[PDB]
Amino acid sequence: ERRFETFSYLPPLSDRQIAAQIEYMIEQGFHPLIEFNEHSNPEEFYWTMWKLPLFDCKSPQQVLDEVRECRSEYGDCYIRVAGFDNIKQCQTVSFIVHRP
C-alpha cells in the first residue's frame, strides 16, 4: 500500500490528537501552513498553498476550522498540514490529514 511519509502507519488520527499536534506546533513558535495536491509522487517537492501562514494563531480551533473549509472546497484532493520555523529557517512537522 502506498504510504505518505511520517504518521502514515498508524490507524487514522483522531481529532483530539490533531488538536494536541496543532497546539504543540504553536507552542515553540512554529506557524501552520496548509497545502493541497492531486498526485502523491515522491519526486515532487512543491505543493499548492492555501492563503498564507496564519501568523495570528490564537487557538487550535482556528486551524481546525481552516482545514475544515479546505476540505469543504477541495475535498477531492490530498490535504496536509506543515509547520514553519523562523529561527533555523526549516520546516519541522509534516503529516497527512485528509485522504481521498
Binding site: 511519509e5 511520517t6 529557517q89
Partner: protein, 462 residues
C-alpha cells in the same frame, strides 16, 4: 649568538599573556616523571611543538622568533589525582596553512607525544578562531539542505546494517536490501570492510543495490537511499567509484575518514559538493585513539576536525549500546557537533567558547547493539535530528526482515508521538511501548522476544 643547551622554562612560561580573538588554543592533560617540575614540562610541551630545539643555532637570530613562538600560559592541577596537570598552550595564526587539516595535526601533535620528561599525555580540546574556520570548505550539504532534499520531517531517520559481515553474493545482497527497504525503513548500509573481495566484486553490488532501491521506491512511494562504500587504495579508484555511483543516480555514499586519510577525505568532500551527492562518514579505528583516559586523543577533537574537513553523517556512540560511551561526554560533543554557538562548560567536557560562523551542521548517528526497548530513552537523549541504525534489530525478527523493519518504524514513531503529545518518555516508556504493540503483532513479537537483553558495563573513560 651563543650556542649551547638552554632550559625551556625561562622562554616559554609567560602567565601574563592574554589570548586574542585570532590565536589558536589547545589544552593538554599530562603527567611527568618524578623530579621534573611541572612548569618546565609545560614549557617543553609548548616549545617542542612550534619552534623548539635542544640547542640554539645561529639561524635563530635571523628571524623574529618572538612573533612565531608558541606560548604556555596556564598550568593547573586537577582535583582527585596526583602528578597530573592541565597545560594550556596558545599559537599565533601565522603558524598554519590555510584550509588544511593535515598541516594542523602534524604541527600540533607531531612530535610532542614521544617526549622523555612526560609519563603520559592527552590532548583534550581545540579552539578554532573564526579567521581560520572561514577558510575551510565546511560540510558539503549540512542538516537543513539534506532534510529538504530527502523530504523527511518530524522524525529521526532510521537505518540498518546488512548481516552477516561477509559471505553474500551480489544478488542475495540486493534481495536482502530490497526486503528490508520494503518493510518501512529508510536507509541501509554496506559494512565497513566490504570494498571488493574475490567473492563479490564492486560493480555487481552497485548495480544490484541500485535496482533494488529503484524497485522499492517505485513500490512504496518514499524516497529511499543506500550508502555505497567507496574506500579504495588510491585516489583514482575512489574517484572512479564515485563517478559510477553518480551515474546510476544514487543519492548517498559513505567513506571511512581515519583509516583512509584526511587528504582523500577532503578531496572526496570537495568532489561530492561539486556534484551534489550526500557524504556519510564512519569513525573506524577511533577506539585505538580515544579508549584510554591518560593517553590518546579525545574524540571531540576528531569531531571538530571532521566538521572542518567535510561530512554530513557521523557516528557518535550509543550510550546504552555495545560500544564505549559516557552520557555526559556524548551529549557535550554532540552539542559541539550540531550547534553554532557553544559556551564554555567544564561539566560537559567542553573547554572553550567556539563559534562556527554559520557553517552548517553535521548529523550525529547512533548504531550498534540496540533493539526496540532502547527506543524511548534514545529519543530523549538525541532529540529529533538524528539517525538511528539497528544492527540486529530488524533482521533478527523471527519473521524475516519486513516484519522487523515495520516493528522498528512503528516503535520509533510511537515514541515520537508520545513525546509530541506531552508525555514523559523516560518514566512511561514501557507503557508507551506496550500500548504501541497492542495492535501491531510484529511490534508485540519484537517486544516479547527482546526484553531480556541488557548491557550494563562499567565505563573505562571516567
Amino acid at each position: 649568538y651563543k650556542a649551547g643547551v638552554k632550559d625551556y622554562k625561562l622562554t616559554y612560561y609567560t602567565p601574563d599573556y592574554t589570548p586574542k580573538d585570532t590565536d589558536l588554543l589547545a589544552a593538554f592533560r599530562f603527567s611527568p616523571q618524578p623530579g621534573v617540575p611541572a612548569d618546565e614540562a609545560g614549557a617543553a610541551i609548548a616549545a617542542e611543538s612550534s619552534t623548539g630545539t635542544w640547542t640554539t643555532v645561529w639561524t635563530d637570530l635571523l628571524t623574529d622568533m618572538d612573533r612565531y613562538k608558541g606560548k604556555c600560559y596556564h598550568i593547573e592541577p586537577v582535583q582527585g589525582e596526583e602528578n597530573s596537570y592541565f597545560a594550556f598552550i596558545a599559537y599565533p595564526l601565522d603558524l598554519f596553512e590555510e584550509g588544511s587539516v593535515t598541516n594542523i595535526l602534524t604541527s600540533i601533535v607531531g612530535n610532542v607525544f614521544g617526549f622523555k620528561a612526560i609519563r603520559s599525555l592527552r590532548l583534550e580540546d581545540i579552539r578554532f578562531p573564526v579567521a581560520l574556520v572561514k577558510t575551510f570548505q565546511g560540510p558539503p550539504h549540512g542538516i537543513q539542505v539534506e532534510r529538504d532534499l530527502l523530504n523527511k520531517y518530524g522524525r529521526p531517520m532510521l537505518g540498518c546494517t546488512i548481516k552477516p559481515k561477509l559471505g553474500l553474493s551480489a544478488k542475495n545482497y540486493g534481495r536482502a536490501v530490497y526486503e528490508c527497504l520494503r518493510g518501512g525503513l529508510d536507509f541501509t548500509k554496506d559494512d565497513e570492510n566490504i570494498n571488493s573481495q574475490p567473492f563479490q566484486r564492486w560493480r555487481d553490488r552497485f548495480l544490484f543495490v541500485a535496482d533494488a532501491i529503484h524497485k522499492s521506491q517505485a513500490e512504496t512511494g518514499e524516497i529511499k537511499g543506500h550508502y555505497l562504500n567507496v574506500t579504495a587504495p588510491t585516489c583514482e579508484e575512489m574517484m572512479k567509484r564515485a563517478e559510477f555511483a553518480k551515474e546510476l543516480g544514487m543519492p548517498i555514499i559513505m567513506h571511512d575518514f581515519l583509516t583512509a586519510g584526511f587528504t582523500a577525505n577532503t578531496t572526496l568532500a570537495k568532489w561530492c559538493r561539486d556534484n551534489g551527492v550526500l557524504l556519510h562518514i564512519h569513525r573506524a579505528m577511533h577506539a585505538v585513539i580515544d579508549r584510554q583516559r591518560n593517553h590518546g586523543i579525545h574524540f571531540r577533537v576528531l569531531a571538530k576536525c571532521l566538521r572542518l574537513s567535510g561530512g554530513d553523517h557521523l557516528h557518535s556512540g550509543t550510550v546504552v549500546g555495545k560500544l564505549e560511551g559516557d552520557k555526559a561526554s556524548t551529549l557535550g560533543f554532540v552539542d559541539l557537533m550540531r550547534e553554532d554557538h557553544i559556551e564554555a562548560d567544564r561539566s560537559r567536557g567542553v573547554f572553550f567558547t567556539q563559534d562556527w560562523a554559520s557553517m552548517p551542521g553535521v548529523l550525529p548517528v547512533a548504531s550498534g547493539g540496540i533493539h526496540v526497548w532502547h527506543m524511548p530513552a534514545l529519543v530523549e537523549i538525541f532529540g529529533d535530528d538524528s539517525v538511528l541504525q539497528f544492527g540486529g534489530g530488524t533482521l533478527g525478527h523471527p519473521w524475516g526482515n519486513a516484519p522487523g523493519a515495520t516493528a522498528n518504524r512503528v516503535a520509533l514513531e510511537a515514541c515520537v508521538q508520545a513525546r509530541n503529545e506531552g508525555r514523559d518518555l523516560y518514566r512511561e516508556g514501557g507503557d508507551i511501548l506496550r500500548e504501541a504493540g497492542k495492535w501491531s503483532p510484529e511490534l508485540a513479537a519484537a517486544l516479547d522476544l527482546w526484553k531480556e537483553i541488557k548491557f550494563e558495563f562499567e565505563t573505562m573513560d571516567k
